[PDB]
Structure formats: structure tokens, C-alpha cells
Amino acid sequence: DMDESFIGKSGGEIFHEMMLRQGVKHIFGYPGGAILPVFDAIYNSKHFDFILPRHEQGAGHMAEGYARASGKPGVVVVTSGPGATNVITPMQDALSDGTPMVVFCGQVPTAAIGSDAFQEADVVGISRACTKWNVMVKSVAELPRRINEAFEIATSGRPGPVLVDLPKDVTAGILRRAIPPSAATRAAKELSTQQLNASIKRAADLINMGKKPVIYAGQGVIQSEGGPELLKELADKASIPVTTTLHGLGAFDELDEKSLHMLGMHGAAYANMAMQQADVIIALGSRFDDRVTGVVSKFAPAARQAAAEGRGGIIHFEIMPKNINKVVQATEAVEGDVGANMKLLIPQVKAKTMEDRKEWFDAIKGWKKKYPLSHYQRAERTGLIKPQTVMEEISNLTADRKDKTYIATGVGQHQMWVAQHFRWRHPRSMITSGGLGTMGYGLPAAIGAKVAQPDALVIDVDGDASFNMTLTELSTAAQFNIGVKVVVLNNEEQGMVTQWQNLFYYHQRNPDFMKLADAMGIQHQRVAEPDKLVDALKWLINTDGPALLEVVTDKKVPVLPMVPAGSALHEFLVFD
């Protein structure tokens, strides 16, 4: 069957109509020459709100935070050439962290491609390696199909960024024509179904054998329909302790007695202890990246010994086949959506009580007593604010509304401190750049997050160097009155790299953040005395509209515990 409703509409007008059909309600973008047919067509549209950032890197990272906070794909519209290349970093960022994004960019007319035309770049060639799929739309008649293909690809499997190049003749032009089982299919499907059920049955047998089980949950659980609920059901039924990755934070309730909190190079000592001695590791929507495993050959020794002896090992619930057996050899690989497959797993996992796991949870509670996160060096009343305490007091101050609190971060020491010291209870509350780790992410991601969740508290916990990268987007929050709260940790150092240069081998001076925030039209306060911190934070989270709070912290504060390079996950250095 064929669609006639586009006949006589420009490509720009068709685009505006496809945003309607795709449920898009917010677009982030910046105009220019090649994309003008599309901007003219979304001119004053009542069908979605349009955020104009300062820089189209702002637009991309806002689209990521929007996606992180809502589960919907962030949509970006930029011009050809430098408008497209300015989104390359957010694209690689989204690909690394599985964030769904559709990036639409102008392109010179199809006839001009290859001529080195004004504002021409081989954007499909540049962006291939940093998108999950991309395409140049070559005729207004294929435009609605390509837009669909793009939205579906971004949002399925492991989500990811997709780039659609829109030549100016495609969007300024006028469409003039209408546009659009098996026996072997049933046998292929049953062959896949048998393979999946057998995998889940063996996964359950392994879990049922295990005397020291652990769930290693990641972002995939949060990105799965019903994932957190199913995870809770599984952890409760079999009384299994649960650790998350940085991106899995909030997938499990960190006030539950079974919570091990975050594992990894900067994770809880007890989470790492648990993973190093578990005999069954159940990896749910996580990818064994190197910040988590440490030296891979030393990762999970007891799980490997168990697999070796037929009495356990490593179970891996993964939707993307390329990520199965990439880094760690799974004893049992359960392919596909972790929500759907946990639904089939749980009724075959036998129930176990806490009392059944007394020895395991006694070891875990021992490690928690010995290595509590809350033990670090606190400020003397005449010193500067400790950064860990900033995170603790933000968590205390939001404890009664964690279901509507979104934390976005920069990259560095502060990103690890909030992971460690804020208590995570809400899925999608952690909005942070993990795989690529892009300083500058925090403020624009927080802005997009607040756009997606206008009724939530959204805080950008941002180190000063990171915040210096994209601080121009404060104008975006001010122009549009997007009520993000910004906490700038001013220590005048690139804390994470000076931590590395102090362990393995040295520091910039900041603008005046009160004057700057004044220049940008943002409510602002400064705070350096420990006794004043809590009240400063109460002011920030109760302001109306966008606000910023500078927290003068001291320098050379360690991130502990840390698993240094060359060490195993159990070879962490904690505070003494």
C-alpha cells in the first residue's frame, strides 16, 4: 500500500510531519544554510519544543541527557559541515554508552557532493565509526522511510546514535509521487527458541548450585522493560547480593540489605571482595569493561575455579551478540533482552532465604564493617569543604524524593565520589558519561534531563575543569528557563589526572563563577566553610529556575577505595 499524504510537501515539511508520527516532543538543534528548508518547516511548530543551545555539542549532550532521563531517543537538528562535525563527540559518547539518538544534519545538494562545496564535509564517512548506523537521504521520496529506519535502529537492540544526512535539494524539494511467515522461518524460530530455553535452563541450574552468588547488574537492566522489578524479584527470591556498574546505579535499591553498591576500580571494597569470591556471577546488562574487571586474567578467580570444577561460573544476559565473549568467557550466555529472559529464568531459580546464605552474607557484612564507604577524612572546621561530604549531603537532602531526583556529572574525581557517596535508588537517576568519559557532558546533559523531566529535581555535579568545557550552555538554561541546579566543585585542579600523576608519575585557574553566573543570568551562591555547606545546598535545591552553587573544596583529595592499574579487583587501597 502507498501513502499519498506527502504529495506536494517539501522534504522539510515531510520531516516536520515525521517528527509528529514518531512522537517527538523535543528537538535540540542549531540552524544554518544547508538545513534551512527544515528550520523553515518547523518554524513555530506547536507540536514540539525546540531548544537552541550555544554550540551544537551542547545540542548533542542535551539529547543524551534527555534520552538518559526518559528512555526516548534524543533528537538533534544541525546544519552541514561544522554543525555536523560539532556533534561527533556526543555521537561517540552515545555509541559508547548505548544512548539512543537521531542526529539530523544538513548537507550540500546531492549534485554538489564531492566538489568541496561550501560547508561540505564527508559526514557519512566521518560519522560511520562513531554511530551504530548512518545514511544520506538521496531523494525526497525515500525520506519518510529513512527517518523510520533511523528511529528504529537507534532504539532497538542496544540503543545508540544514528546520523541522517539531509541534502538541501532533498529537503527543499517537493515530493510528487506516492510512497510505501514461511516454513523455514518457523523452523529457524523454533531452533532459536530451543537454543534460548536450554541456555536459561542451564543458567538456572548453575544459579541453583551456587553457594556464593552475586548479581552484577548494569545499564541493560535499566534499559529493559520491567528490568529493575525483575532484578528485585530475582535477588529477593534467591537472596542474592547485587552490585551495579556506574551506569547500573539506581537499578537496584541501595538501601536494601543485599546491595553491594558499585563495583570496579573505584567501587566499594566489599562489592569487589564479593565478585572475587563468588562462585556464580550473574551478569545482567553489563559488559565487563576494564574499569570493572581490573586485570582480566585476575578477574573473578572463584567463579573461574567453579566453572573449572563444574559447580558454577559466569552467566551473561546480553542483547548484543558482539558483546558476548568479548572480554570474559561466559559459562552460559543467555542472548537477548534481559527483562524478557529474566521472566523465563526466575520461575526455575529455587528460592533461598537469607538464613540459607548466612555464611555468604556474614562475609559480606564483615567486609562492609571493615570498608564502609562513609569512612573518609572529614574537614576540620577551618578547612575547605570535603567533596565526599558534598555528595553525602546531597543524598541526605534528597532522600525523601529520590524517585524524582536526577544526578548528571562531569568526568573525574567528583564523578566517582558521587557514585560512591550518593545512595542510588531510582532507575535512570544516574546520568553520566562512562565509556567515552566526556568532560563537558554534565551541564548540557542535565539541561536535556530537566527538559525530559520538568517536574523533577535535576542536579549537575560538575568538576571545575569539566564545567569549564561547556559552561557557555548556562545561557541555554537561562534563555529557556530550564531549572537545572549546578554544583561546581572548585578545587583548581584536574583531580583525576593529578591522582594518576601522583600514583604513576603534575592544574588550571578558573574564572570567577559568581561573576560568570551573574553574567549568564543564573541565581548563584558560593560556599567554602564546612558549617555552611548544608544550608548552601538547601538554597540550591529550593530555588525556582536555574541556579548554580560553587563549592570551594580542597585539592589532592584521594578517590578511595581505588584498584590501581596492574592490580586485581581485590587489591584495592582504602582509606587508613
Added chain:
Amino acid sequence: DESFIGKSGGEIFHEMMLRQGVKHIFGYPGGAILPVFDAIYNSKHFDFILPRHEQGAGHMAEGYARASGKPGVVVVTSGPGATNVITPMQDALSDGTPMVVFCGQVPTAAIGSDAFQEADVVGISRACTKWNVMVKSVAELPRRINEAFEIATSGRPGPVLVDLPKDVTAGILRRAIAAKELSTQQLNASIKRAADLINMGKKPVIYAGQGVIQSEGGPELLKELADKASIPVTTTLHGLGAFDELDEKSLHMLGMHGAAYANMAMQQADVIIALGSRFDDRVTGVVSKFAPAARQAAAEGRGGIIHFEIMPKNINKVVQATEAVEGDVGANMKLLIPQVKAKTMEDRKEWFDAIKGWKKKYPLSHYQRRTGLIKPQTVMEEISNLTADRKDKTYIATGVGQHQMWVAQHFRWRHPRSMITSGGLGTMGYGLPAAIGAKVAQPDALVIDVDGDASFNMTLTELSTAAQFNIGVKVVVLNNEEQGMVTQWQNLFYEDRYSHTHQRNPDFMKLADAMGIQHQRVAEPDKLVDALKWLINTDGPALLEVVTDKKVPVLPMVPAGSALHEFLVFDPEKDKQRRELMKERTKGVH
């Protein structure tokens, strides 16, 4: 050979910088590049500039390379460090700026595993570099640094990217490291043929671009040719400064926002001598209607298009050259001039009388000027006036948009490399970072960033870099509260439907105050001259905000679909009824 044994890849890098004459490095640390960073940071052999954003690092390296003819050197970490340099890289590829981007990478054993901060950077940056390579072993490090500097500076210069895996730069080095030129006969034959074309030309025009400024001895030779044969000279945007715009033969800039008289001359010339330029679509208008008089001449055998070009892929890409002269334009101009016959201005009275008549008919000074709000063209005219005694030590970097065309049109360019601007990619945000790198390259010169507000908003965080390092650039921010160039396009083509082309703007006085940078704001026509006098006479970084008139069109304009001679010109009556129809639609808002 054998001299580098025992040293780490970082130390080896450190020395290849010495052997390449690198005195200035722009960069930003990370884990994967720390071996290189430990090496060269703290060294007394280099000035290391640490910006806020690696994009700043790249544009800085571009402006440094524009003002100095030396390659800009960038050192960043893997992943987000390298991807943040992709726009500077594309921008440099499009404008032929020599640049060597060194970026950290994960250890070679970790590549392809989605390791921490890993990207396929050679894959991402292949399409936007001249060439790129991943260094696979300490031993190939010297050879690859050499090749990279060689490619970035040869032919048409451009950016190269070198991927440095962390184990290559931490590892220790333990090893050691017939023809017949009938081509000369043919080059010489075609230089002679080109001279015969110039000598027979009755209406010659030199169309000069950036390749002249990029060729050693290029401007000197361009002036000798133009003087000897009395040939009028027009330049592209990047060519501004290759020829003295105060010379009576100067036609100024051609193209979509070129002088009407330069465009006229190109369309009526019978011999177009194209020196180190590439027939950009911002230059030619509709190509089929470009250079009718020279195509007509070429057919009849009495003229045509001479193209002096170093990159073969760029000859005959857009326009058929009647006579192509491949190679360096300066070296080839040394061989051309002795074969060209001297002619005085008077020998060419008829041609220069046509040009003079075009100049009276369409002077660049005829724009709406009574003294309520400041007009952006006057700002550019006064900068030209106030630096007239020092144009040879004056460097202008710009953003992208109306202000960039206005300074192209209304500043009188006289110094090679004085025009520092993004023309090929056209990257808003280029100005301030490029001005910072230029002033690093020319510490004793006066360096000005003529920036529109939207452009400036893109990268204004680099004001901290000028403050921290005390890099004395002078910033002129034209405050019109709009994406001026795009509102023109929407006014022209879209019935004043101003779709998302207006932005708030921070308080620039407070912003400059916040960054520790001396600052003034001017809004009155009477005070403009004193404002700019204060700015150019400060010490260290400074910023001036000029509040200007809104909705000011850039004229003349050759709009889309027009031949180079079919331009629009300023009409006082159309302008006051353009503002009036704009007010009914926008319902009193504009």
C-alpha cells in the same frame, strides 16, 4: 639511527619536536597521552598552551599556523580528547592549514575491545585529514612523526593525525633506525604558453587566493607581475592581504559578497590568471554563467583561464583551465614574469576606465549610515583607519557570518597572513581561539578577534586561556542579538520567518569581568572611535562590546541562482520598506 636507544616513546616524541622546529604546542592531558605529556610539559624547549576545550586547542593551532606559516601542533588524549578535535581538523582540511594532531590511544592490546576512553579515531578522522596513521611500535615513532610533518606541510598543506597508543609512548626503544625530467620541458612549455595568453590579453584579471600567501615569495611575485603588466588584482576571502588593497589596481574581494567591481571585472575579463585559488562556489556564482568573456575568448583562441595550482586534483575540478601550470605558484611565477611584457596603466586606459566606472557606480562605502545605533560596517572601517599606520603588524581573526563579510569588505587588507578566518568549513567559534594562537605566534603584533555574538558564544570559555596565559588578543564582539547571516537568508528566501535565529546573550561586561579581562561597552556612534582606540591601546587581553543595529543586510550580494554579475546592491528606499514589511509579519517584534 641508534641515537634514540634507551629512551621512552615520550622522550623520543620530545626530540622529534626539536628536530621539527616546534616551539609551540597546544593540548590537554589525559590518561592515554600522559607518557607524551610528562615528556614535553615542563620542558623549556616548548611553549605549552593548555586551553579549556580541545576544540580550542585545535583552532588555536590553526590560527598559530595561519599567522606563522609553521604547522600547528596539537596533543590530546584518546577518545573524547581526539573527537573534540574533529571540527578543527575538518576546518583545517577545508582551508589547507598545516596541523599535526597527536592523540593518545589505549594500549595496542586493548584496541578493538571498547576499552576505557577508546574510539576508532583513525577511522573517524580518515575523511577529515590529509592522512593519518596509528603508531604500532616505538621503533616506527620517528619515521611516522617525520612523515606526518612532511604531509601536513607539502602540496596543499592540511591536517594529519597520529594515533599514539599508551604502550608505544611508555615503551623503551631497543633497536636502531634512472629518470628523465621531460616534465621540466612540459612545465616550461606551458609557462611559455601562459605568458603568450597574458601578453595577448586585452582585459586581464589576476584572481589570487590563499596559495599565494602560502607560497614562499608569493606576494612579492604577485606584486611584481601585477606592476610590470598593469593587471588588476582581485583576491578571495583567504587571499585578503596577498595584494595591497590600497594599490590602484586592487579590485578587492570577489564572489558572493565581493565588491561589485571585482565581480564585473571577472565576468568581462578575457584572461583570468588564477593564482593559488580553487574556484569555490562562494566565488563563482552559477558556474555555467561564470567568466563568459574568458570562455568566449578561450573558444576563439585569444585568451582563457590560466590556473597556477599545486594540487592536481584541484585543476579542472570546477572550471576548465585553458592553460594549467602545476606546482608551486611562487616558483612558477619566477619563471612567468620575465616572459610577460611590461605595460603601463595608460596602455590599459580603456580597461581601467571600465573598472573606475564600476567603482564609482558601486562603492563599498554606500551603505545606510542618523547617529542613533551603531552600524557594523563603520566598525570595520574604523578598525582599518585606526590601524592604518600598522597594517603590517596587524592580524584580524573572525567568527563566521555577517561580521566576517563586513570586515572582508570594509577593512583595507595589506599584509600577507593578516586575514585569519574560517572560509571552507565556516566554523563559528573559530575567532577567539584562532586569535589566541595567532597572538601566540606573533606576540609583538596587534591581534584582533572580530567576532559576532553567536560565533563568540560558541567558544567564549577560551577567554580564560587568554587571561591565564596573558595572551594579549583584543576582542570586538558585535552585539546584534541574532544569527545575522541566517536572518538575512530567512529574510531573503523565507518571508521573514525567523526560525530559531535569535539568542539571549550573556552580559559581556560581567563575562569579561568574570574572566579577569579588561573590558568596555560602546553603543553610541559618537563614542565608537574612542572605544576602539582604547581597545587597541590596552596591554594584555581586552574585550570591547559594540552594540549594533539589527537586521542589517550584507551587500553587495550574489544570491543563489545568480550569475556573478547579477548582484544586489544597497538601495535606501528598498531598505526602509524592507524593515517595514518585516515589522508587519513579525508583528512589531522585528
